[PDB]
Structure 1
Amino acid sequence: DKEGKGLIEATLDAVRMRLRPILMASLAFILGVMPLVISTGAGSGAQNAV
């Protein structure tokens, strides 16, 4: 559209320079929720459910 074309060969250059975000933002999310899954079996079982 606003840049220079690409049916198959623009999807690549899209998915070639942003997997850093989509991994590290996804990774900090995994570990940020890690204290909820277990780590605590006394405070609340609601942390486990969430």
Structure 2
Amino acid sequence: EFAKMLKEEGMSLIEATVAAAKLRLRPILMTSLAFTCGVIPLVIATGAS
């Protein structure tokens, strides 16, 4: 979506893609690590069911 926005600005596809990736890099790790760390208890925990 941000690549589309940068294209709408008129800024080239490669440079738009890299800029959007740079802008959105940190939230990607945010959400990904959030979910991944949230499921750590399931694998480690041992017990009933």
Runs of 4+ that moved beyond 3 A: none
Q: Structure 1 unaligned runs (5+)?
A: 45-50
1:5 to 11, 15, 18: 11
TM-score, length basis structure 2: 0.70
How big is each residue's C-alpha offset from its partner over 1:7-46, in whole Å with a ceiling of 9 and x where there is no partner? 21111111110111100111111110000111x21132xx
| Aligned alpha-carbon RMSD (Å) | 1.4
Q: Which residue of 1 aligns with 2:4?
A: none
Count of residue pairs the alignment pairs up: 43
Q: Which has the higher helix share?
A: 2
TM-score, length basis structure 1: 0.69
Q: Structure 2 unaligned runs (5+)?
A: 1-6
